Ligand binder design. Structure first.
Ligand SMILES: O=P(O)(O)O[C@H]1[C@H](OP(=O)(O)O)[C@H](OP(=O)(O)O)[C@H](OP(=O)(O)O)[C@@H](OP(=O)(O)O)[C@H]1OP(=O)(O)O
Ligand SMILES: [Mg+2]
Lengths: 373, 111, 49, 222, 56, 34
RNA sequence: UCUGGUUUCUCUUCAGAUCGCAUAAAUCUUUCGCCUUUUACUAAAGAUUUCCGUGGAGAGGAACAACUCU
RNA sequence: CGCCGCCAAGGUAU
């Protein structure tokens, strides 16, 4: 997953379509690059690695658009989840004042989340076959296993839906189950992020109950997608959600003479060293560890710097992990500089992304998520 | 508080040092020491007041134009570091607010 | 490069620096890691030949 | 006129043994990370320095200028900082950590890290500085062709049933110094070459282009 | 001089590795020989055939 | 330059350089040697 | 059985190769820093030469040229 | 993380 993400800007704001054409030529020349433009006007580029983005910016600056270019400080694309189940049930409203869809949300297991991320189950299967697979894998209820519908982001991400927690027949007249409107609303509403404009993962949403209008051709049948949007991530953000940072799995080859330096540069950067393996052949041997991607900035450079040239490291994208802190923490004072070793760094990590293109702060459940009448 | 004037005093003080050095055609730190300068006229010499030996401050240059960061990374002043500790003039001049707070109570007790 | 020097009977084989001229870009001859490939169409004989 | 020379390997091994106490044990160009000529060109052009490296004068690109609203919308106390961006990150590659580059050179990355176990004892396959995790004397986990020693002598001609060589072993007295001289520095890995001059040849050349040894004064490092 | 003193060797003089200063003061005369060659040729011209007051 | 700063013109001003470190700072963890 | 040549000393132009596994000075045009005017200067870029050496090529000899590659 | 090291013409007339 291309996870590092830098903002890009021209020095002169006048000659903007020339760097647009150069950036498009880079995107043609570099396939794993993904460029985006947002409501705040600045262009952003997410790529795979540091030397990859190095060669990208080299060919962007001095071959395809020969203008001076300012960049921002690097940051990674981070994700969102919930860790416990819901403690309160949501509420719905529409401009027809007709529907009332109440629902909740609860987490999953990370192995089957990686399995559905790695195209193990597919939407082209039969209903009962993948129902029986999910049945024998996640010891689920039989009546609610086969009653699922289309999956989350690109029908692949672990954001599944289960309709049959609270009993199966309510109306079932015309729509009666999530078929076209709510499914496409979740397709169009899972990439644009709920909390701080970042995606969700490892959370499934289950409807408690719902009701359809008397005539969806006359009343709201296409006027319930932002309602479904608001109710889904209102029920998500009321369950005390958390953020997820990526780790890099790192493999280091190093001699035994300068060995403690990689341990000191991982323990300073919160490294959980897993495997110290003496390999046959070369006296240099391997260290397999986990490091945060936000602390991966110049990892191999400083690693070769402390080991005076003897060691070498490689980084790769690992799956998501839980950050030290919660986004909904209030009455807390965050210093602008002086990065925190403290266990409440996620509040800083989300206010410094809502000071970005973002939204407006004070995300408590008062205005857009619930109606305290 | 003004760092750019503390740099200017260090720049001009060593410049008049060098101007007196080229009058002797010496320009040497070891042959022509600063002991020649920092001695009073009553015992003999020229008699001058040190502001280069104040250990002028610096800051993070990336965030110096951005935000008041505090105090970090002291910079040396003059090229004299043999631990003689030539004092600064301002530590023997009474400040503004001390003079005003003393003046109010002095005139109050005088009345 | 070894198989293309088998192919080409016109060589400037390495004496001082390496002859990795398949890494063609200027940002991959100086790093020495390779950023952009370029595939080569050749012939190879077998033990029949 | 004393132009071109060709030596032999024991004679040059004696030269390599007599040329110690001023020659480095460095074999590859991996100790020179941020000590390369191109990294020093980058440090010259980018108004920065390596701790232990040179400090040049800047060039034509002294003063940058961006007005208040544009770099305000670009940079406030807004970026997610975890560790400060050091100057070694920019001297490594000045393209995503630093803006507006010119007169810049681009350095080397990851020569394949030769380790070169030295020898002080005969019997060249010494098997030292080398662990081994393979369980010896018993392993089978994959199928193999011909599990049946049944074929009798039919096609191996006895005039050349033997291997290629038995007239000499794979090691003798002057092969350890040869493979030690294979990974030797530049004046010793040749066996043949040209004649230089007494002002041409540098002697203090691999000393200063290193790291600074600890426990030394400030005048030796300047 | 700080690579003689490593180990039990001694602080006193004996620093007799002279090739390095020798090479750079050969590099001096290597570039200064045509310069003051031309200067002494101009000196011999100014001394032996006289000066040019209002020529060039 | 250890991290960010130094002096580009030591020959212009009447100084030699050598920015020190502020020993009067207060934070939790700063050492690397012990 | 025929084919039959390495060094050293003198001219002869071409050099595009870390011409040299290293690297001196000067001139001009600009930016600086000491500076009173200047030569002596500081140290960065741009472009020219000078200079200590080197590379391959045409000849005339001599040095064991007859040992012998072919 | 540690600048900097100085000669002369300018005056005892031609
Ligand atoms: O005074 P230091 O800064 O410590 O350096 C001195 C100095 O060398 P430098 O002044 O050039 O740096 C001496 O040379 P002098 O200038 O005093 O003549 C030299 O002696 P040599 O002339 O033999 O090179 C030797 O001093 P010493 O006499 O003790 O050998 C040396 O270093 P150390 O003083 O640290 O030994
Ligand atoms: Mg005059």
């Amino acid at each position: 997953t291309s996870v590092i993400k830098i903002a890009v800007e021209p020095v002169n704001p006048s000659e903007l379509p020339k760097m647009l054409d150069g950036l498009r030529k880079v995107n043609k020349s570099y396939p794993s690059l993904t460029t985006k433009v947002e409501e705040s006007g600045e262009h952003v580029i997410l790529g795979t690695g540091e030397l990859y983005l190095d060669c990208v910016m080299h060919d962007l600056r001095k071959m395809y658009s020969e203008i001076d270019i300012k960049v921002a400080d690097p940051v990674v694309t981070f994700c969102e989840t919930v860790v416990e189940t819901s403690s309160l049930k949501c509420f719905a409203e529409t401009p027809n004042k007709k529907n009332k869809i109440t629902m909740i949300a609860e987490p999953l297991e990370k192995g089957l989340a990686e399995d559905i991320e790695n195209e193990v189950v597919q939407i082209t299967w039969n209903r009962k076959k993948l129902g029986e697979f999910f049945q024998t894998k996640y010891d689920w209820d039989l009546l609610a296993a086969r009653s699922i519908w289309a999956f989350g982001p690109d029908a692949t991400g672990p954001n599944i839906l289960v309709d049959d927690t609270l009993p199966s027949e309510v109306d079932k007249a015309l729509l009666g189950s999530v078929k076209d409107s709510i499914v496409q609303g979740f397709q169009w509403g899972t990439r644009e992020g709920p909390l701080c404009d970042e995606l969700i993962r490892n959370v499934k949403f289950k409807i408690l109950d719902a009701v359809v209008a008397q005539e969806p051709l006359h009343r709201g049948g296409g006027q319930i997608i932002p309602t479904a949007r608001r109710v889904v991530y209102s029920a998500f953000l009321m369950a005390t959600p958390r953020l997820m940072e990526p780790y890099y799995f790192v493999e280091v080859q190093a001699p035994a003479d300068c060995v403690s330096a990689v341990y000191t540069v991982l323990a300073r950067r919160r490294g959980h060293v897993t495997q110290d393996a003496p390999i046959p052949g070369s006296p240099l041997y391997t260290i397999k560890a986990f490091i945060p991607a936000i602390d991966s900035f110049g990892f191999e450079t400083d690693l070769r710097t402390h080991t005076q040239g003897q060691a070498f490291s490689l980084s790769v994208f690992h799956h998501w992990q839980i950050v030290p802190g919660d986004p909904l923490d209030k009455s807390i004072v965050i210093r602008p500089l002086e990065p925190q070793p403290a266990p409440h760094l996620a509040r800083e990590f989300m206010i410094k992304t809502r000071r970005r293109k973002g939204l407006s702060e004070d995300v408590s459940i008062s205005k857009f998520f619930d109606d305290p009448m | 508080n003004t760092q750019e004037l503390l740099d200017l005093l260090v720049k001009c003080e060593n410049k008049i040092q060098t101007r007196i050095k080229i009058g002797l055609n010496s320009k040497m730190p070891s042959r022509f020491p600063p002991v020649v300068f920092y001695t009073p006229k009553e015992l003999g010499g020229l008699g001058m007041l040190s502001m280069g030996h104040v250990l002028i401050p610096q800051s993070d240059l990336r965030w110096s134009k951005q935000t008041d960061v505090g105090i970090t990374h002291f910079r040396s002043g003059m090229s004299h570091e043999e631990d003689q500790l030539i004092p600064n003039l301002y530590r023997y001049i009474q400040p503004w607010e001390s003079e005003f707070i003393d003046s109010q109570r002095v005139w109050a007790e005088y009345a | 490069d070894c198989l293309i020097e088998q192919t080409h009977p016109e060589i400037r084989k390495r004496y001082d620096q390496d002859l990795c001229y398949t890494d063609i870009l200027f940002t991959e001859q100086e790093r020495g890691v390779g950023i952009k490939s370029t595939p080569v169409t050749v012939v190879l004989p077998d033990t029949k030949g | 006129t004393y132009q071109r020379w060709q030596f032999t390997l024991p004679m040059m091994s004696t030269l390599y043994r007599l040329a110690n106490q001023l020659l480095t044990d460095l074999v590859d160009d991996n100790y020179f990370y941020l000590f390369d000529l191109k990294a020093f060109f980058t440090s010259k052009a980018l108004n920065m320095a390596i701790p232990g490296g040179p400090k040049f004068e800047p060039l034509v690109r002294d003063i940058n200028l961006q007005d208040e609203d544009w770099n305000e919308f670009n940079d406030i106390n807004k970026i997610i900082i975890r560790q400060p961006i050091r100057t070694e990150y920019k001297i490594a590659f000045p393209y995503l950590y630093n803006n507006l580059p010119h007169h810049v050179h681009l350095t080397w990355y990851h020569t394949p890290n030769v380790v070169f176990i030295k020898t002080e004892d005969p019997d060249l396959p010494a098997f030292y500085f080398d662990p081994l995790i393979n369980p010896i004397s018993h392993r089978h986990s994959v199928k193999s062709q011909e599990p049946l020693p049944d074929d009798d002598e039919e096609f191996e001609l006895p005039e050349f049933v033997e291997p290629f060589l038995k007239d000499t072993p794979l090691y003798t007295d002057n092969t350890a110094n040869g493979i030690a001289l294979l990974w030797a520095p530049r004046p010793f890995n040749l066996r043949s070459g040209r004649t230089r001059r007494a002002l041409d040849i540098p002697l203090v050349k691999n000393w200063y282009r290193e790291h600074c040894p600890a426990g030394q004064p400030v005048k030796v490092r300047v | 001089y700080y690579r003689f003193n490593t180990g039990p060797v001694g602080k006193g003089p004996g620093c007799g590795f002279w090739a390095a200063g020798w090479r750079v003061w050969l590099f001096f005369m290597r570039g200064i020989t045509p310069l003051l060659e031309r200067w002494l040729g101009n000196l011999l011209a100014r001394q032996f055939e006289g000066r040019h007051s209002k020529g060039v | 330059m250890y991290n960010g700063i130094g002096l580009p013109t030591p020959r212009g001003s009447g100084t030699n350089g050598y920015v020190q470190r502020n020993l009067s700072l207060v934070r939790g963890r700063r050492g690397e040697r012990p």
